[PDB]
Amino acid sequence: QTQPRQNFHVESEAGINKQINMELYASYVYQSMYMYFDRDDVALPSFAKYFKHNSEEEREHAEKLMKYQNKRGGRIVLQDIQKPDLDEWGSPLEAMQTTLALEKSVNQALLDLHKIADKHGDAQMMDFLEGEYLKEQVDAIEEISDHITNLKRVGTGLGEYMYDKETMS
Amino acid sequence: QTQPRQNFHVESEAGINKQINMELYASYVYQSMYMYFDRDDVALPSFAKYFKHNSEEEREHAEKLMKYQNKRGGRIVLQDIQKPDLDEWGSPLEAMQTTLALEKSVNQALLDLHKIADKHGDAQMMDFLEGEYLKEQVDAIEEISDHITNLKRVGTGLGEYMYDKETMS
Amino acid sequence: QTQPRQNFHVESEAGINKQINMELYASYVYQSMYMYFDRDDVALPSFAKYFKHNSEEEREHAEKLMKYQNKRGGRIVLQDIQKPDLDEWGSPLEAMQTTLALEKSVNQALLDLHKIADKHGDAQMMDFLEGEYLKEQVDAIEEISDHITNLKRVGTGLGEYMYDKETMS
Amino acid sequence: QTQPRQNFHVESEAGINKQINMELYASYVYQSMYMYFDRDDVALPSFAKYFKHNSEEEREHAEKLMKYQNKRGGRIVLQDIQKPDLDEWGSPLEAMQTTLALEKSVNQALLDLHKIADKHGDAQMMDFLEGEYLKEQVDAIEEISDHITNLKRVGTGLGEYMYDKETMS
Ligand SMILES: [Fe+2]
Ligand SMILES: [Fe+2]
Ligand SMILES: [Fe+2]
Ligand SMILES: [Fe+2]
Ligand SMILES: [Fe+2]
Ligand SMILES: [Fe+2]
Ligand SMILES: [Fe+2]
Ligand SMILES: [Fe+2]
Ligand SMILES: [Fe+2]
Ligand SMILES: [Fe+3]
Ligand SMILES: [Fe+3]
Ligand SMILES: [Fe+3]
Ligand SMILES: [Fe+3]
Ligand code: NA
Ligand code: NA
Ligand code: NA
Ligand code: NA
Ligand code: NA
Ligand code: NA
Ligand code: NA
């Protein structure tokens, strides 16, 4: 076995590799939304900045899981990062609704990964996932839900522009 | 020949004199737009200051070409600065669409001037035009495109006022 | 046509999209090398940090090309980011030799993209590529060449450790 | 019952007393390694300081568990602190390999103590152990694994001396 390995099951190791790829995938989706709102015919620069920041956060989530894999004596196995499902993301409201679905799918994957750790008595991995991932996902999901509600309230046109200026900046 | 002159074709010299006049013309157009948005019956003061600043930048572009003409040993020959095509420029959206057309025509003139330098092997003039003019024009055309998109999004009335207050200020 | 588009050929637009993917691919390679030297059984933390930094730099190279695509009126089309060719990278010397080959392939691809711009008279794109990409590539290639020479000089064992402590950070 | 006692099983109380002694034992092992590397015929002062620091940390781990025992209404019952298995600890590599085994034994004991808390539904004790002990043990085991790898890489003689100077201090 690797030097650090203790109470670390191969199924947990494999599950961490799967979650690493999912975090990178999310980072790529947000990078695409970033550059979509940077288009001259969309031109909402604080939305663009918001997705730039979320793309960087997802990349950090991936690297923290990579570091954790190494810390436990697992071996990182990278997979292709699949391109996002769309090249264009619609209105600010539609992009936020897409983001809510993405963050809920990531959250479900983390909960499933936590279940693997629980199944194998990996108390430290469960605590790592809870404090470093599950808590952040609950915060992120509520924040996106707030965005969607406000975007529905302000409507299209001037409301989108003001939301870019007031909340997203 | 003038003391500095080296690898500097009379056709490039003549082309710089033509471009100097075009920069001064663009400066005059923006000065007219500045004072149009300064009218009591238009009264959008940040739009006014935006065109004031662009008028000053265009004058700086013309003076930098005048200095370059002297530096290469060319001789500056000034022409009349033609008045702008209109006395009044319509809505903020229409004024910005007019500005996009102006900046694209200046850009095409600069590209044509670059072709003259290339035809005569004027490597230094090509680099001067690329770094000091071509790059700036691409940035300017994108920025104006962003303005047009945002002005379409916010609409007339309150939207034009808020655009003045948020983006243009 | 998109609002900004001027003197911008579809072949150049397509080549930029291809180069974006290659920059992202190189970022992924360096991220893998980062986490490889982070392994408990490799444990060279300044090599790790070097590849972390180079991964971040490649991601910025990609995003600068994405921003340039938008500025010229092109449309970003993302593709899958392929996983690196290896899961582990051997010695510090072998990883640096792999890095040299990677940077030379990126450089040849950028030179080929420059040839597309030249073919279509895209003066501004050539200057953008020269100043923002070609210059950095010859600096990076020389720097990696220096690393390879020093790694050959110091040998394996204590030499790799000291190079980590003294040159890499 | 003692005033604070709530949801605190006698088996968990006894397990904490056992772990207190194990932390004290680890502290004593590190204090011995500290003074071994302080010997005139070993004379690696940064290794010495490293084990001095680790001896203090283990003593703090013990005192934090004693404090927790009191907080829950348990009663501390101290046992003899057994002397370390050796009087001399060999090479830096051998000492680090011994410490990896020690930290893995401590980690297994903590995981077994966590199982006792789980068996009796002691949610607060499980969280205390996870956040204050299990996380630290995973970090410590990885750090020692790094040391072992580097010590194998640099070899004996000058490599040991340089490791003392560069990494340990
Ligand atoms: Fe994430
Ligand atoms: Fe739990
Ligand atoms: Fe917990
Ligand atoms: Fe100009
Ligand atoms: Fe690059
Ligand atoms: Fe040429
Ligand atoms: Fe050139
Ligand atoms: Fe150039
Ligand atoms: Fe301890
Ligand atoms: Fe405001
Ligand atoms: Fe305001
Ligand atoms: Fe040093
Ligand atoms: Fe030193
Ligand atoms: Na923009
Ligand atoms: Na694939
Ligand atoms: Na006024
Ligand atoms: Na005249
Ligand atoms: Na490490
Ligand atoms: Na001494
Ligand atoms: Na005894």
Author numbering:
A (entry chain G), B (entry chain R), C (entry chain H), D (entry chain B): 3 to 171
Sentences from the study reporting this entry:
The Fe-binding position in the ferroxidase site of TgFer + Fe is consistent with that of TgFer. The Fe-2 and Fe-3 ions (intermetallic distance Fe-2–Fe-3 of 6.10 ± 0.09 Å) with occupancies of 60 and 70% respectively are each coordinated by three water molecules. The Fe-4 ion (80% occupancy) is coordinated by the three OEs of Glu132 residues (distance of 2.75 ± 0.24 Å) from all of the 3-fold symmetry subunits and three water molecules (Fe-4–Wat1 3.12 ± 0.14 Å, Fe-4–Wat2 3.07 ± 0.08 Å, and Fe-4–Wat3 3.17 ± 0.09 Å distances), while the averaged Fe-3–Fe-4 distance is 4.30 ± 0.10 Å. Four iron ions ligand environment inside the 4-fold channel is completed by the eight OEs of Glu132 residues at distances of 3.10 ± 0.13 and 3.15 ± 0.11 Å and a water molecule with the Fe–Wat distance of 3.97 ± 0.18 Å. Although four iron-binding sites are coordinated by four Glu168 residues in the TgFer + Fe structure, similar to that previously reported His173 residue for RcMf, the E168A mutant has little effect on the oxidation rates compared with TgFer. Similarly, significant differences in the iron contents were observed between TgFer + Fe and TgFer + CuFe proteins, which were measured at 2,637 ± 2.46 and 240 ± 0.97 atoms per cage, respectively.
Accordingly, ferritin plays a central role in taking up iron (as Fe2+) and storing it in a stable and unreactive form (as Fe3+-oxide/hydroxide). The crystal structure revealed that TgFer presented a typically 4–3–2 symmetry in a cage-like, spherical shell composed of 24 identical subunits, featuring highly conserved organization in both the ferroxidase center and the 3-fold channel.
